[PDB]
Amino acid sequence: DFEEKMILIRRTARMQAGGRRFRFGALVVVGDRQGRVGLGFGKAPEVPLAVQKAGYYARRNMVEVPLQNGTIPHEIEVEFGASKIVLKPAAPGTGVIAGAVPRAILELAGVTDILTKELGSRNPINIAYATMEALRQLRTKADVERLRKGE
Amino acid sequence: PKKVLTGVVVSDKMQKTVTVLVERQFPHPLYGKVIKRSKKYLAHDPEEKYKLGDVVEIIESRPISKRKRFRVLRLVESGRMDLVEKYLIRRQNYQSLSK
Amino acid sequence: GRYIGPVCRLCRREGVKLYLKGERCYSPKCAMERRPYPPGQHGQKRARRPSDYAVRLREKQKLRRIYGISERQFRNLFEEASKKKGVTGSVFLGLLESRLDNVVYRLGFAVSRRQARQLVRHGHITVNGRRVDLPSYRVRPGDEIAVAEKSRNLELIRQNLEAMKGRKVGPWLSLDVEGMKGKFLRLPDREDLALPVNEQLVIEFYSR
Amino acid sequence: MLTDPIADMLTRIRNATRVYKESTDVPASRFKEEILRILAREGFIKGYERVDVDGKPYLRVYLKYGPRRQGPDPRPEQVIHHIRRISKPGRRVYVGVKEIPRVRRGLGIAILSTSKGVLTDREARKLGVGGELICEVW
Amino acid sequence: PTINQLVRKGREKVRKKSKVPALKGAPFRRGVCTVVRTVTPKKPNSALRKVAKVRLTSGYEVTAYIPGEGHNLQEHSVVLIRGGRVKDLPGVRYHIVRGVYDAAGVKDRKKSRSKYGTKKPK
RNA sequence: GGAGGAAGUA
RNA sequence: CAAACCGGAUUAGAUACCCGGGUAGUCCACGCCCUAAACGAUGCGCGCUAGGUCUCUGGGUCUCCUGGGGGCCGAAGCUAACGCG
RNA sequence: AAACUCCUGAACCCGGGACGAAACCCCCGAGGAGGGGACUGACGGUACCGGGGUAAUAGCGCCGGCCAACUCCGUGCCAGCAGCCGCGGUAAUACGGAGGGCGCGAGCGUUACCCGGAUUCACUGGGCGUAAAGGGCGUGUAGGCGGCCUGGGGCGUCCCAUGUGAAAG
Numbered sequence: 007d008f009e010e011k012m013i014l015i016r017r018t019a020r021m022q023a024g025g026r027r028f029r030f031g032a033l034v035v036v037g038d039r040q041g042r043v044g045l046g047f048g049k050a051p052e053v054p055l056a057v058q059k060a061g062y063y064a065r066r067n068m069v070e071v072p073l074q075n076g077t078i079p080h081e082i083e084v085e086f087g088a089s090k091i092v093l094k095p096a097a098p099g100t101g102v103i104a105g106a107v108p109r110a111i112l113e114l115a116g117v118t119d120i121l122t123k124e125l126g127s128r129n130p131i132n133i134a135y136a137t138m139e140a141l142r143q144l145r146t147k148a149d150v151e152r153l154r155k156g157e
Numbered sequence: 158p159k160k161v162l163t164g165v166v167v168s169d170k171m172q173k174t175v176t177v178l179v180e181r182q183f184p185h186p187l188y189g190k191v192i193k194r195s196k197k198y199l200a201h202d203p204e205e206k207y208k209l210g211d212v213v214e215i216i217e218s219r220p221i222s223k224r225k226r227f228r229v230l231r232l233v234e235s236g237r238m239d240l241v242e243k244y245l246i247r248r249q250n251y252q253s254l255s256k
Numbered sequence: 257g258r259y260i261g262p263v264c265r266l267c268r269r270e271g272v273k274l275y276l277k278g279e280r281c282y283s284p285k286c287a288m289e290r291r292p293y294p295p296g297q298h299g300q301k302r303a304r305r306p307s308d309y310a311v312r313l314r315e316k317q318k319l320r321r322i323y324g325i326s327e328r329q330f331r332n333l334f335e336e337a338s339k340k341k342g343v344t345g346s347v348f349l350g351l352l353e354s355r356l357d358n359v360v361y362r363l364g365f366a367v368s369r370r371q372a373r374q375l376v377r378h379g380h381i382t383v384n385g386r387r388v389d390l391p392s393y394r395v396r397p398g399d400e401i402a403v404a405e406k407s408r409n410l411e412l413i414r415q416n417l418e419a420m421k422g423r424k425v426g427p428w429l430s431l432d433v434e435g436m437k438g439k440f441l442r443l444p445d446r447e448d449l450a451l452p453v454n455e456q457l458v459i460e461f462y463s464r
Numbered sequence: 465m466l467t468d469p470i471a472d473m474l475t476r477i478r479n480a481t482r483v484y485k486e487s488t489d490v491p492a493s494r495f496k497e498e499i500l501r502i503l504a505r506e507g508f509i510k511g512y513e514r515v516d517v518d519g520k521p522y523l524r525v526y527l528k529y530g531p532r533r534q535g536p537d538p539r540p541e542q543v544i545h546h547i548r549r550i551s552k553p554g555r556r557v558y559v560g561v562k563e564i565p566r567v568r569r570g571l572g573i574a575i576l577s578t579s580k581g582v583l584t585d586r587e588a589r590k591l592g593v594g595g596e597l598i599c600e601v602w
Numbered sequence: 603p604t605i606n607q608l609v610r611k612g613r614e615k616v617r618k619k620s621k622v623p624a625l626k627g628a629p630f631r632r633g634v635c636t637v638v639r640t641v642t643p644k645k646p647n648s649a650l651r652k653v654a655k656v657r658l659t660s661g662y663e664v665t666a667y668i669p670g671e672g673h674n675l676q677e678h679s680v681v682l683i684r685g686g687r688v689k690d691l692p693g694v695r696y697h698i699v700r701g702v703y704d705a706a707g708v709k710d711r712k713k714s715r716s717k718y719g720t721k722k723p724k
Numbered sequence: 725g726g727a728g729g730a731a732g733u734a
Numbered sequence: 735c736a737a738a739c740c741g742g743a744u745u746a747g748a749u750a751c752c753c754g755g756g757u758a759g760u761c762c763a764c765g766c767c768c769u770a771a772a773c774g775a776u777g778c779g780c781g782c783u784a785g786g787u788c789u790c791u792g793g794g795u796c797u798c799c800u801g802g803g804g805g806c807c808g809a810a811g812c813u814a815a816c817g818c819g
Numbered sequence: 820a821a822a823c824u825c826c827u828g829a830a831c832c833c834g835g836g837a838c839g840a841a842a843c844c845c846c847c848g849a850g851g852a853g854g855g856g857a858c859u860g861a862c863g864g865u866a867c868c869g870g871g872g873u874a875a876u877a878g879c880g881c882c883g884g885c886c887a888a889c890u891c892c893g894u895g896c897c898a899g900c901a902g903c904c905g906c907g908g909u910a911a912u913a914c915g916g917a918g919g920g921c922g923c924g925a926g927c928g929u930u931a932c933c934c935g936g937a938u939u940c941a942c943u944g945g946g947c948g949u950a951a952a953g954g955g956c957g958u959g960u961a962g963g964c965g966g967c968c969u970g971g972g973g974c975g976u977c978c979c980a981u982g983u984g985a986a987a988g
């Protein structure tokens with residue numbers, strides 16, 4: 007009962023004694039719009055096979071994303087590699103304004119409104135992979151009270 | 158508001174006139190740093206008892222000369238020559254940029 | 257000023273029944289219920305993946321074509337919604353149904369907005385007892401939309417006034433057949449008028 | 465020559481959180497102790513106490529740590545996720561009330577000092593008074 | 603850098619420079635052609651691009667590219683100017699607008715006509 | 725395993 | 735000993751590598767140019783962040799403690815990586 | 820979509836006909852207060868109003884990715900297109916034409932300029948081992964910066980009131 011959106015399908019090769027052997031890798035984002043999302047990246051020697059591996063792996067990196075009336079609870083900067091991303095939430099009536107890549111990542115979590123901007127290296131593999139980790143570093147108004155106390 | 162200003166002299170070398178140097182301290186409209194800006198005024202000492210080192214006050218007064226539109230007001234302290242150095246030395250740093 | 261061209265193409269191009277003709281619309285000869293595929297040669301041919309920019313253009317075109325309007329007014333009456341306080345996506349759907357050429361359609365005086373605009377423009381509809389011949393008339397609350405008594409006897413209105421008799425008017429209007437006057441009550445919500453539009457996309461469109 | 469020692473403290477903190485430790489000694493100024501007073505008055509820290517090491521005065525900081533997260537890297541979810549000096553000696557920050565910065569739309573903090581005393585964001589806005597922002601912790 | 607280094611030295615506007623230095627800043631210009639030596643494109647091409655050197659009221663002598671089904675521009679012929687480069691013409695900065703003064707349009711055309719001075723027939 | 729200090733021709 | 739210079743030889747030719755000589759120079763006193771792969775291609779100063787390990791140099795009743803340095807693997811962290819630590 | 824039947828009727832025609840214009844003046848009244856009376860329109864016989872009455876201009880750009888929107892023909896490194904990549908070296912979704920499709924619409928495109936996109940002068944918001952970047956090193960003036968505690972003045976700083984911040988924006 008999930009939803010697959012392919013970020014990108016590209017082509018990589020490698021020189022071989024007498025030629026080049028192509029291989030394929032994919033970036034699908036498993037989604038549901040319930041806040042449970044997933045990102046994967048599988049390497050295959052043919053197209054509709056990586057989509058499985060990419061589709062697979064994501065069904066493992068499950069991420070529970072909180073939702074506050076249709077957006078994000080707080081403000082986060084999370085950099086990964088040379089790729090950077092900054093997510094400031096938005097009151098409704100705004101719309102998921104993000105790059106064509108992370109839009110999927112946030113859409114498939116149930117996010118309807120959120121302010122964003124890619125920054126640094128806008129390579130998707132770096133930009134995606136970062137967004138998930140950014141979503142993972144999110145917290146909610148409750149976790150703070152559990153952290154800053156403990157009885 | 159006839160702009161009272163306080164500043165250290167710089168000279169006692171002209172008749173009935175001195176050189177109050179006042180200092181302004183403020184942020185930077187672009188950078189959060191708080192910087193210094195200083196300016197030199199010429200003042201009216203008719204008693205000729207305001208001399209070097211005297212830390213005085215000045216006021217936006219009636220025109221007295223071309224660059225002399227302020228009066229001396231009162232005294233704050235006299236024993237301040239180590240600041241005059243910082244003027245005496247700066248202008249003497251200005252020396253070494255020539256042929 | 258308006259489209260004036262072939263209409264059923266719109267409905268096919270967007271893959272949605274745009275109710276623009278009138279009585280033929282719900283008939284089994286609606287081009288979509290005849291040829292439900294995008295027109296022009298390459299209809300039955302495999303339509304490739306919709307570019308992430310595509311689906312946000314088409315829904316924008318759906319609404320654009322649903323109300324019969326250009327794209328300056330669409331934008332300009334969208335700018336207002338973005339500035340006016342409230343949720344950007346449905347204030348815009350508020351200042352739209354407020355347009356005079358719409359209301360008459362919603363009042364069943366005409367089965368088509370395209371049909372309705374003509375009646376508005378021709379000196380037939382009356383607001384608060386005045387000959388308003390403007391389609392783009394932001395109808396405010398508590399307004400008296402009615403067919404002009406000077407022209408409340410044509411062979412068109414009565415047929416389509418009778419055609420309503422006891423129709424489920426929009427849960428926000430007040431229709432009086434034979435009285436021919438329909439009062440503008442409150443103002444709409446998307447939940448009050450369900451359309452095949454993810455209006456949020458039009459936002460996400462007009463933010464690119 | 466140790467120019468900003470307030471930030472030295474903050475710097476001492478991170479490099480003691482980010483390696484997960486119990487104590488971390490730091491020179492004590494009454495301004496610094498007042499900071500922990502308003503830092504620990506939340507829950508970022510257990511507390512402190514005036515001490516004395518090698519015949520010299522320091523400040524043990526009972527650093528507080530979240531719960532052991534599960535799986536690979538079982539280091540606990542860090543409490544003080546991010547603490548950084550603001551009013552640097554190379555650039556000092558002076559703001560009023562109508563511009564005090566919210567921190568993590570509430571979920572953070574913003575510690576500052578003013579004439580009615582050292583205070584935080586939401587505390588300062590209560591008094592309708594502001595001052596030199598010292599730091600902010602999320 | 604430092605915050606102190608900044609107030610003292612500061613930053614400099616990048617101040618990018620123009621690629622249409624036809625002077626004045628006017629978008630178009632009138633001038634009289636002087637040369638028409640169809641020259642060869644860059645590396646990955648090999649045609650006889652139709653070129654011409656123009657001398658404007660700005661007083662500058664610069665080439666210009668010619669478009670479409672031929673033309674009628676001879677040695678002495680008043681013309682226009684435009685903007686846009688050509689990857690294959692290292693030295694052609696402008697273009698030629700047709701249908702103005704002596705630069706007549708292109709006969710026989712129906713797709714894209716505003717760009718070639720072609721009217722609507724029947 | 726890392727680190728330091730024996731060729732004629734397009 | 736050897737730039738430049740001459741000759742011998744290899745060569746398709748050899749204004750070069752190989753060889754026979756060989757001046758300036760490299761050496762000393764004084765006064766200049768002030769240039770560099772002047773490189774650790776890493777400005778100086780201070781505080782905090784695990785260790786293990788050979789060694790130079792002090793001190794302290796000593797396969798122990800401590801202070802200043804040069805090497806070598808590596809905690810967390812950082813980098814695009816190599817890698818630094 | 821067309822033709823076709825019906826329906827209204829932009830233009831057109833006639834008749835009425837403005838708001839903007841009530842005061843200066845005159846009378847009573849003191850040349851007061853107050854009140855009463857009367858002349859005045861370029862816009863314009865315009866707007867508008869009453870009645871009658873004909874379906875009656877559509878163009879431009881694009882269709883390889885960016886960038887929504889596909890096929891045929893001729894052309895064959897020639898003719899050409901082109902903002903970056905680039906395409907055309909026979910079977911072109913890029914060139915010229917058509918059919919068609921996409922976007923706007925009394926407008927559509929080109930060019931030029933300003934800001935952005937350009938976190939690509941980095942205050943928010945960057946770096947200097949190998950990518951452009953550590954001065955060849957030292958000493959040191961002005962300047963920048965500075966350990967702990969106590970008291971003062973309150974220059975920067977912060978708070979309240981008041982003035983200003985004109986109108987238009």
Ligand code: SF4
Binds near residue numbers: 263274286
């Ligand atoms: S509903 Fe009406 S406008 Fe839409 S395809 Fe059918 S006939 Fe045409």
Ligand SMILES: [Mg+2]
Binds near residue numbers: 127
């Ligand atoms: Mg970059």
Ligand SMILES: [Mg+2]
Binds near residue numbers: 194
């Ligand atoms: Mg000055």
Ligand SMILES: [Mg+2]
Binds near residue numbers: 758
């Ligand atoms: Mg010689």
Ligand SMILES: [Mg+2]
Binds near residue numbers: 766767
């Ligand atoms: Mg010499």
Ligand SMILES: [Mg+2]
Binds near residue numbers: 488489
């Ligand atoms: Mg420590």
Ligand SMILES: [Mg+2]
Binds near residue numbers: 886
């Ligand atoms: Mg576009």
Ligand SMILES: [Mg+2]
Binds near residue numbers: 896
């Ligand atoms: Mg050929």
Ligand SMILES: [Mg+2]
Binds near residue numbers: 941944
């Ligand atoms: Mg900066």
Ligand SMILES: [Mg+2]
């Ligand atoms: Mg290299």
Ligand SMILES: [Mg+2]
Binds near residue numbers: 954
């Ligand atoms: Mg220099």
Ligand SMILES: [Mg+2]
């Ligand atoms: Mg005011």
